[PDB]
Amino acid sequence: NTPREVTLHFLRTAGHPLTRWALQRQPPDPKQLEEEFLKIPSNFVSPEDLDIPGHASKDRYKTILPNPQSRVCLGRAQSQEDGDYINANYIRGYDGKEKVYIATQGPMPNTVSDFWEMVWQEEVSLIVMLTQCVHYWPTEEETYGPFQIRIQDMKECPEYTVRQLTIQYQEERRSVKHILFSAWPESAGPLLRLVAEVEESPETAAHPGPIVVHCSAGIGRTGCFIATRIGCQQLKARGEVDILGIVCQLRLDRGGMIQTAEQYQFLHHTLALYAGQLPEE
């Protein structure tokens, strides 16, 4: 069978379930975790696999491309702009539940309207931004294509900034919550606090929409955050986590999720911290 079907077979059958006790008390050593990560195929799509004319000006990186099986197709809200193309994929969440996250690259000045279009059509109530990219949100009030965004409220937390945005499209207004994480990491503390912030965030849309997560390329820091979230959900609900199975399921939705083995080993560390933080009850 073809190397492409070898890739698909590995990402569907590989799994290393770890009990809450094994993750905390006897975890795989870094050498084993590194070999395990290196076995996982990147699942990158080549420019030859996409037949979407005029997409290259929309991409930040020519090598990092959205998988066509699960990419986000834009609607027709924009007039001075044809094409349904955005560098973004739908990500399955806990138990392979459909469209729980959208992993996307950092918006370029020419893709800012495309980004706000996605937020509107997908009924997104929450955006998580991971950084240490152009500012696509206004300081007070800006118009981006057919969309008007206004800052309603802004609070400063020791680790992330929370903005309450209102997106306006003709007669319709929607509320979107925006969290900007600053420290991305040295420690996993701030990351679990970010996850708790996401967990405490109410749905503000008519129908539950996916959570937009981005960094710059939308695969590295984006991939860790989503894997942490699902991993926390596995530990809370089951008492075990299959980290290898999570990463593999991510690679199927978007190629290249989690770039480095350091990120893989930190992922084990974060979920180990979370396990100790669970109710006693």
Q: What is the distance between the alpha carbons of residues 93 and 90, in angstroms, rounded to a whole number?
A: 10
Q: What is the distance between the alpha carbons of residues 72 and 262, in angstroms, rounded to a whole number?
A: 30
Is 103 annotated as belonging to a binding site? no
Q: And the tokens for 242? A: 């299959």
Q: And the tokens for 90? A: 């739908």
Q: Parallel, antiparallel, or unpaired for β 141-144 and 126-130? A: unpaired
Resolved by: X-ray
Q: How many domains does the chain have?
A: 1
Query: Who's near 159: CB < 8 A, 6+ residues apart?
Result: 181, 182, 183, 190, 193, 194
Q: What is the distance between the alpha carbons of residues 105 and 84, in angstroms, rounded to a whole number?
A: 16
Q: What is the distance between the alpha carbons of residues 128 and 122, in angstroms, rounded to a whole number?
A: 15
Residues of 192-222 as b/e, b for ≥16 C-beta within 10 angstroms? bebbebbeeeeeebeeebbbbbbbbbbbbbb
Identify the H or E element spanning 172: strand 172-181
Nearest to 38 by CA among 219, 265, 266, 202: 265
Q: What is the distance between the alpha carbons of residues 124 and 204, in angstroms, rounded to a whole number?
A: 8
Nearest to 123 by CA among 174, 78, 77: 174
Q: DSSP code of 180? A: E
Residue type, 272: A
Cβ-based burial of 114 (10 A; exposed 0-12, middle 13-18, buried ≥19): buried
Nearest to 252 by CA among 41, 100, 86: 41
Is 22 annotated as belonging to a binding site? no
Q: What is the distance between the alpha carbons of residues 206 and 245, in angstroms, rounded to a whole number?
A: 32
Alpha helices in the chain (DSSP H): 3-13, 20-24, 30-39, 112-121, 189-200, 221-237, 243-253, 261-277
Is 216 annotated as belonging to a binding site? yes
The answer to whether the CB of 261 falls within 8 A of the CB of 75 is no
Q: Give the resolution to one decimal, in Å.
A: 2.6
Residue 130's domain spans which residues?
1-281
Query: Who's near 206: CB < 8 A, 6+ residues apart?
Result: 123
Tell me how many helices (H) and strands (E) the chain has.
8, 11
Is 259 annotated as belonging to a binding site? yes
The answer to whether the CB of 77 falls within 8 A of the CB of 41 is no
CA distances to 83, 116, 121, 275 from 74, in Å: 8, 10, 8, 39
Q: DSSP code of 210? A: P
Q: CATH number of the domain that 9 lies in?
A: 3.90.190.10
State the Rg of the chain over Cα.
19
Residues known to be catalytic:
215
Q: What is the distance between the alpha carbons of residues 136 and 108, in angstroms, rounded to a whole number?
A: 8
